[PDB]
Amino acid sequence: GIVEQCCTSICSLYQLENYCN
Amino acid sequence: GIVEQCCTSICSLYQLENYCN
Amino acid sequence: GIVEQCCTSICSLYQLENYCN
Amino acid sequence: GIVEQCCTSICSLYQLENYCN
Amino acid sequence: GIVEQCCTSICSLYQLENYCN
Amino acid sequence: GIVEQCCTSICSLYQLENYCN
Amino acid sequence: FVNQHLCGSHLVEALYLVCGERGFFYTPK
Amino acid sequence: FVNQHLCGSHLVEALYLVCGERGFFYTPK
Amino acid sequence: FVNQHLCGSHLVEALYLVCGERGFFYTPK
Amino acid sequence: FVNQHLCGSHLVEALYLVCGERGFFYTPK
Amino acid sequence: FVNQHLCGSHLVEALYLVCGERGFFYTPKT
Amino acid sequence: FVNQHLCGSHLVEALYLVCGERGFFYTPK
Ligand SMILES: Oc1cccc(O)c1
Ligand SMILES: Oc1cccc(O)c1
Ligand SMILES: Oc1cccc(O)c1
Ligand SMILES: Oc1cccc(O)c1
Ligand SMILES: Oc1cccc(O)c1
Ligand SMILES: Oc1cccc(O)c1
Ligand SMILES: [Zn+2]
Ligand SMILES: [Zn+2]
Numbered sequence: 001g002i003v004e005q006c007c008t009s010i011c012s013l014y015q016l017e018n019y020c021n
Numbered sequence: 022g023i024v025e026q027c028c029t030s031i032c033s034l035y036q037l038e039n040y041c042n
Numbered sequence: 043g044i045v046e047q048c049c050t051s052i053c054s055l056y057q058l059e060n061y062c063n
Numbered sequence: 064g065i066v067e068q069c070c071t072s073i074c075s076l077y078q079l080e081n082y083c084n
Numbered sequence: 085g086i087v088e089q090c091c092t093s094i095c096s097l098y099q100l101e102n103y104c105n
Numbered sequence: 106g107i108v109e110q111c112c113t114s115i116c117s118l119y120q121l122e123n124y125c126n
Numbered sequence: 127f128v129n130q131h132l133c134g135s136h137l138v139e140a141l142y143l144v145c146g147e148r149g150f151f152y153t154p155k
Numbered sequence: 156f157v158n159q160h161l162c163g164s165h166l167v168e169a170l171y172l173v174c175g176e177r178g179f180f181y182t183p184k
Numbered sequence: 185f186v187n188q189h190l191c192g193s194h195l196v197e198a199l200y201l202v203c204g205e206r207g208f209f210y211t212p213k
Numbered sequence: 214f215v216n217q218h219l220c221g222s223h224l225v226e227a228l229y230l231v232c233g234e235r236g237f238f239y240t241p242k
Numbered sequence: 243f244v245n246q247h248l249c250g251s252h253l254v255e256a257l258y259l260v261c262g263e264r265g266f267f268y269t270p271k272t
Numbered sequence: 273f274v275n276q277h278l279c280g281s282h283l284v285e286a287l288y289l290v291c292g293e294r295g296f297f298y299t300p301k
Contacts, residue, residue, distance in 0.1 A: 003183050007162040010277045013034060013173050013230065019181075020174035021153060022242040028220040031131045034172060034231045037224075040239075041232035042299065045154050049133035052189045055076070055144050055260070058137075061152070062145035063182065064272035070249035073157045076143060076260045079253070082268075083261035084211065085213030091191035094218050097118070097202040097289060100195070103210070104203035105269065106301045112279040115247045118202070118290050121283075124298070125291035126240060129216075132223055136190055138171045140259055142164055142181070149182040152171070156245055158275070161252055165278050169230055187214055194219055196258045200251055200268070201286055210258070211265035222288055229284045229298070236299040239288065243275055248282050 130154070188212075276300075 002019055005011060023040055026032060044061050047053060065082055068074060086103055089095060107124055110116060134154060141150040163183065170179045192212060199208040221241060228237045250270055257266040280300060287296040 001182060001184060002166065003159060003163060006166055007159055007274060010274055011166075011169075013169075016169055016173045019170055020177040020179050022240065023224060024217055024221055024241055027224060028128055028217055031128055031175075032227075033175070034227065037227050037231045040228055041235045041237050043153060044137060045130055045134065048137060049130055049186055052186055055140075058140055058144050061141055062148045062150045063180070064269060065253060066246055066250060066270055069157070069253055070246055071156060073160045074256075075146070076256065079256050080260050082257055083266050084209070084264045085211055086195060087188050087192060087212055090195060091188050091215055094215050095198075096292070097198060100198050101202050103199055104206045104208045105267075106299060107283060108276055108280060108300050111283055112244055112276055115244055116286075118286075121286055121290050124287055125294040125296050126238070128220060132219060133186065133190065135168065135171055135223055136193055138167045138181075139164060139255065142167045143256055143259055145181075147183055149180065149184070151178070151180045152174075153178040155176050155178065157249065158245070158278075161249060162274060162278060164252055165281055168226070172227055172230060187216075190219065191215060193255065193258060194215075194222060196254045197251065197285065198289055200254045201289055203268075205271055207267070207269040207271070209265065209267045210254075212263050222285065225284045225288045226281065229281055232298075234300055236297070238295065238297050240295040241293065244279060245275075248279060251282055 138152050141152065167181055170181065196210055199210065225239050254268050257268065284298055287298065
């Protein structure tokens with residue numbers, strides 16, 4: 001999930017936007 | 022400045038990008 | 043919801059838990 | 064103290080409460 | 085206390101240092 | 106730069122002031 | 127409204143800590 | 156050392172800023 | 185109220201920064 | 214109330230996230 | 243890496259939240 | 273990396289506070 005995706009390497013703001021409602 | 026522009030109405034990340042180097 | 047409830051007065055930790063999954 | 068107990072392994076809020084006044 | 089002193093007008097870090105141990 | 110100086114060891118407040126305008 | 131924007135920033139940090147493994151659903155609208 | 160926990164706190168802040176009025180679900184699982 | 189609660193959050197961060205190894209007592213009061 | 218001071222604190226966090234490796238000047242005024 | 247220092251920053255925010263009107267003593271070194 | 277990312281977030285907040293009215297320049301190399 002997000003922790004695996006975004007805490008091993010930095011997620012861009014676009015990648016983060018994936019998780020918005 | 023940035024405080025005047027952004028502390029009453031929300032500056033989007035897109036608008037904030039104008040302040041980057 | 044959370045803004046009307048918790049930005050207008052201080053929510054307790056139990057009150058914040060209403061918004062947990 | 065708190066740094067030893069809580070920066071090595073995750074402390075819950077209940078565990079952290081032991082450091083309150 | 086600190087909230088009265090520092091939440092209505094800004095306290096410098098030097099003023100805040102009064103609250104250190 | 107700042108990341109090399111201050112992410113590998115703790116910078117003092119005086120060291121941080123180098124990066125003030 | 128910036129006031130709501132700043133409050134929400136604190137809200138999500140508090141939810142992060144209090145919700146733990148449950149996670150949370152932040153829906154301001 | 157509790158870096159996943161610390162990373163999560165920054166992650167929710169970043170999500171908060173990106174998502175705006177849309178909001179977001181955060182699940183550590 | 186909420187304004188003081190949000191302010192207090194920033195105060196503890198500034199105390200953490202300025203007090204260093206000494207630490208601090210925070211009492212809302 | 215210290216609202217401009219607190220707003221600026223959130224602003225610099227937003228700028229950090231948006232600007233990435235570009236960095237930024239923060240010049241209040 | 244400055245891990246303990248950064249961790250402490252989060253610890254004080256978590257004490258602020260949980261202790262409420264009681265407040266707290268943060269005493270890193272002890 | 274992540275670590276450096278998270279560190280930079282705390283760095284900008286400390287600069288904001290210590291620099292006060294001067295402001296600061298954040299340039300990750
Ligand atoms: O990958 C991440 C993790 C935490 C914050 C962020 O902006 C990006
Ligand atoms: O207009 C603002 C003010 C503070 C933080 C932010 O992301 C936007
Ligand atoms: O009512 C609130 C608002 C923001 C943070 C918090 O813990 C409670
Ligand atoms: O174990 C920890 C360390 C830092 C913050 C926190 O909420 C818990
Ligand atoms: O007066 C204040 C209030 C909150 C944070 C700070 O650095 C100063
Ligand atoms: O070396 C550092 C890193 C982050 C915050 C700080 O005050 C000092
Ligand atoms: Zn705030
Ligand atoms: Zn952190």
